[PDB]
Structure formats: C-alpha cells, structure tokens
Design a protein around this ligand. Structure first.
Ligand SMILES: CC(C)(C)c1ccc(N(C(=O)c2c[nH]cn2)[C@@H](C(=O)NC2CCCCC2)c2cccnc2)cc1
Ligand SMILES: CC(C)(C)c1ccc(N(C(=O)c2c[nH]cn2)[C@@H](C(=O)NC2CCCCC2)c2cccnc2)cc1
Ligand SMILES: [Cl-]
Ligand SMILES: [Cl-]
Ligand code: NA
Lengths: 301, 305
C-alpha cells in the first residue's frame, strides 16, 4: 500500500557520470564504453552565446582542449565528433562500470528518472515527465547540463534525455542521446520560450486507477461519457486529447479495478467541474499527471 | 530553478541488498562487511505470527535454516543472532561493495531516502519523512520487508530505517538498524494502529522558503509574530510546536531571503487561518511538510556526494 513519486535506483547511471571541462566551462558527461557524451555547447564561448557555429568552433579544438575527469582519474581524449547537439569524446579507457544500455527517444507524457549532477558528481534523483510542450519541469542549477534521464525496466538502462538548458519560466530543455532536441528548442541564447503547457490526461486517469487500487473510490460517480464528449470538456481545462490508443493502454487497469475507461473519464470530468471539496487523492490536493499507466502497474504490481 | 521531491543517489545502498529466505518466507537483507541484517520476523511461521516467542524460535533455528542470495551467488551463513527486532546473519564473505557507513537513529520530522526492494533486487527509490506519529507514508508491497532508508553525507551512508510491516491504514512501521522500533509498534500480528498524526511545522516553513527562492511570493505579508502566539495557532491546527531551535535552524534561509522566521511564521499563521484562496505554492495545493531545512538548502545550492 501507499503511492509515491518513485525513481529508478540510480547506481547504474552514477557509475557513468564524469566531469567535462572546455576552457572556463565545466559540465557533466556520460561515459559509456570508450565514449563520453555531453552537450556540444560545452565549446560555446562566453563572448558569443547568441549565434555559435558549432562546426567552426569544433574544428579548432585539439583533443587536449577537453579535460575529462572520472572521480580522481583524468581520462585521455583521443578523438571527438559531433552528432546533432551532442559531442562524443573518444577516450583511451572504456568505463568498466558501463551497464547494459540503449538509447530511446520518448513521446510526450512519458516519465523517466533524472540523476542531477554537478561537476560530474551526483546530487540527487527525481522523477520527471516529458511535458506536452516538450519541456521538463526539472530541478536543475547552473552547471547541471549533461545530467541524464533514464528508465531501467528489466536491468537495461534506457537513456532518453540529456539536459542542455533552462528556459525563462524555469523549465528545462534537452535532447535524446542522439543529440536531437525535444521540441523546437536550440542550443543557443535566444528569446525561445515554452508554449502553453497542458495536462497529460492519460496519466491523470492512470493515477485515478492507482487511487482505486489503493482503496479510495470517493470521486467515482454513476455516469459514463463518450470519448468525444470527454475531449470536448477536458480541452476546456487545458487537458490533452485522449485518443483511442490511450483508451487501449488503460485496458489492463480498467480490467483490474472493474471500472470502465469511459466511466473513469466521467469521474475526471466531474472532478474538473467540482474540485476536491477539501479532500485528497493519494495525498494530493491536485490531479497528478506524471505517472503513466505503465508506472502505476509497476508500483501497484 | 525548479523544486522536486529528491532522493539521495542510491548506488552505494544497491550494492548491499541481498535476498533472505527462511522456510517459505522470503524478504530482503542488508549485507555490510560479513553480516546480513534483516527483520527478525523472517523466522515466524503463520502460526507464530499471532504470539511469537522469538527467543524460542531463534534457539530452534540453525545456520542452515537461512538461505542468503547475493544476486545469483549463495552466501554461506556461519552464525546467527538477534539484536532487538533485527536478525544478524554472519556470512563467510565480507561484502566487497560495503560503503563507508554508520547506523543512525532519526527523530520525527527528519527525512530519508528509501530503496524499495523485492527478492533482494532494488526496485525503486523515494523520499519520505519520519512522521510525528512514527510511521512512514511509504510505498511498499508484500515482500518489501528489509528494504532500508538512508541519508548520505559526503561518502558516508547513514542507515536509519529498516522496513518491517504495514499498518491497517496503509502506512508503514519499522526499526533502526539496531532493531529498535520507531513508534509504539511490535513485530507480530495484533491490533496496532497509527496514532493521530500532526504536521511538521519546521519543514513547512522550510518549504515556504524554497517557494520564495523559486519566485512564489503571494503569501508574504507585512506582519510578524511571536513563538507563543504562533504556537497557540499551531496547536489549534494540529501542527507540531515550533521551538527556538527550529528558528535557529532556519536562520540561514531567513537571512538569505530577507524573511525572518517570525515573519515567515506570520505567513504560515495566515495560511492556516484562511487557506490558500485557490492558489498554489510550488505546484502544490497543500502545505508540504516532508522537506527539512537541510533538504531545501542542499537542493537549492546543488550539494553533491
Ligand atoms: C550556451 C548556452 C546554450 C546558451 C547555455 C548557457 C548556459 C547554460 N546553463 C548552464 O548552467 C551552463 C552552461 N554551461 C555550463 N553550465 C544554464 C542556462 O541554461 N541558462 C540560460 C539562461 C538564459 C539564456 C539561456 C541559458 C542553466 C541553468 C539552470 C539549469 N540548467 C542550465 C546552458 C546553455
Ligand atoms: C510476521 C508479521 C510481523 C506479522 C508480518 C507479516 C507480514 C508482513 N508483510 C510482508 O509482506 C512479509 C512478511 N514477510 C515477508 N513479507 C506485509 C505486512 O506487513 N502485512 C501486515 C498485514 C496485517 C497483519 C500482518 C502484517 C507487508 C505488506 C506490505 C508492505 N509491507 C509489509 C510483515 C510482517
Ligand atoms: Cl515513449
Ligand atoms: Cl518475543
Ligand atoms: Na509577514
């Protein structure tokens, strides 16, 4: 019993975190086999953050311009290349702590764990979601760049996010491990801003199912809804559309609880209309949207 | 910027988790040096559950009654004893991954990270607080017993909690690593219930400071208060008394934000008496009390381990 924001154990990632220094700039890198991955903006100069040309900046670098430190050991850079917005530093030693891993690009609504690091050293671990507007609502300070997001279903680390920058509302933008940004963001100082965000509806429904599994039914009602009427209402509260794919994904939790997916939709419609009237759901006074259906099944098992 | 519920990195603890089996019961153990720690209730049968004589049950046990598995390797048990409600199994191999560590007993209101484990395998990590009623609001399923809670200081793991059991409301009870229960609970199947809980005042103030640091200011006001007046309000709303030591502990955040602990106390007093008026603080519509002052300082300053 109980229901918590739960991250994956971070040890397999901790063993991959290094410090990368170029000039006066220091940030984090991810050391897998003989490669260190980091944001290419480590080579951006202080004097021109507005319109860097990374191809031209990188061709000017020697291997010895990159200082990589793994705990107390200097690692020797022996080659470098850029892939999209990620820099790949080849080093002369493979990380003996490299876990089983893969790179995955995730969709909005997906959750992952973040290991926040500074100077190559871990600070803490928390759970995030890729928001519909392709930001994450992280907790990241100056120098957190290069920290990564990951999942560890079935002993394989799936790296899905590398942190690059902070946007003006204090939310965060980054890339997959192939260096492609999530969303329309770019790695330079521009006026770019996050779009209006919206609530991840399928996740709210999953969390209501978690509440029922945990023994709380107060928010249910006697009604149902069509999928289209639900979306017409939910969008007036800046909720994302619920698709038939989402309805299918919720099938298992519906089956476990006995509550049809569209009956749970009717409950959510009523909660948006009424609020919680001084009550809570799984200890929260707002509707939570950073647990996926998969997360709920994993944690409630 | 941003502010999240944040756990300590769990790697040093993951390397200590093993599976412990006695009879038909499996749960988790903590392998440090050449000793495995786990709940003594591992030796209870379903008959013994109601009124176990742990002295007699242990005497009846021998070393081979305990199977210890570190991943796929069996650890040979070469001795066994009990300390309070914790069983200690001596094994023939020191854990090569043992971190620098201490056993620490924490106070109500203090937070810690939990590494939830099943069958000796780490499954997830979360942050929680020791409630004033000495329960924890954990997330634990059958077989989670022996999962541990911890803090890290530099390179040193302070183990503070071992999970033992679930109470009827779905909250959790356990011990320190010397086997002393937190709270008035016993490791047997009997009538036991969490007492009425209160809110951890110093932690709410810390979280209000975190909110100010992150630009959430609507709840600040011109007023200040005194400890005595505030504590009369706290008692009314089932908040823990605020002591002068709490004020001193917040001193930093007080000096940094420009809001004195008694000035912030005036914000909290008004929030208790009037509510939030439809607004949120740091993404919450409730007053959050599971961040300590130290948690806020570490997250807002980026302390590493
Ligand atoms: C060169 C480029 C792309 C413009 C850049 C510059 C600085 C950083 N930030 C580094 O902290 C940082 C950079 N290198 C080492 N640290 C921070 C950051 O985004 N501030 C932004 C301030 C507004 C203008 C864009 C940059 C940062 C803060 C908190 C959390 N995350 C990151 C990131 C990117
Ligand atoms: C022997 C004793 C002390 C009565 C006991 C029995 C069972 C367990 N529980 C084990 O799951 C368990 C035990 N051994 C292996 N697994 C669970 C547990 O507390 N149910 C309680 C139900 C009321 C009466 C028994 C206790 C459990 C579930 C979820 C989270 N936490 C723990 C704990 C303690
Ligand atoms: Cl995905
Ligand atoms: Cl006894
Ligand atoms: Na005030």
């Amino acid at each position: 019993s109980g229901f918590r924001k739960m991250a994956f154990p971070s040890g397999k990632v901790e063993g991959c975190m290094v410090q990368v220094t170029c000039g006066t700039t220091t940030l984090n890198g991810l050391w897998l086999d003989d490669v260190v991955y980091c944001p290419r903006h480590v080579i951006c100069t202080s004097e021109d953050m507005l319109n860097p040309n990374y191809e031209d900046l990188l061709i000017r670098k020697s291997n010895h311009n990159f200082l990589v430190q793994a705990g107390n050991v200097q690692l020797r850079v022996i080659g470098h290349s850029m892939q999209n917005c990620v820099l790949k530093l080849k080093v002369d030693t493979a990380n003996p702590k490299t876990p089983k891993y893969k790179f995955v690009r995730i969709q909005p609504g997906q959750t992952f764990s973040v290991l926040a690091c500074y100077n190559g050293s871990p600070s803490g671990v928390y759970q995030c979601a890729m928001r519909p507007n392709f930001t994450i609502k992280g907790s990241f300070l100056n120098g957190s760049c290069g920290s990564v997001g990951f999942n560890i279903d079935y002993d394989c680390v799936s790296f899905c996010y590398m942190h690059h920058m902070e946007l003006p509302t204090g939310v965060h933008a980054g890339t997959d491990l192939e260096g492609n940004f999530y969303g329309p963001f770019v790695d330079r100082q521009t006026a770019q801003a996050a779009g209006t965000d919206t609530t991840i509806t399928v996740n709210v429904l999953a969390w209501l199912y978690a509440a029922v599994i945990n023994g709380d039914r107060w928010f249910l009602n006697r009604f149902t809804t069509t999928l289209n009427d639900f979306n017409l209402v939910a969008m007036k509260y800046n909720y994302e559309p619920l698709t038939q794919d989402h309805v299918d994904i919720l099938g298992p939790l519906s089956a476990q609880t006995g509550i049809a997916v569209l009956d749970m939709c009717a409950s959510l419609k009523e909660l948006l209309q009424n609020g919680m009237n001084g009550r809570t759901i799984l200890g929260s006074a707002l509707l939570e949207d950073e647990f996926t259906p998969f997360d709920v099944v994993r944690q409630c098992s």
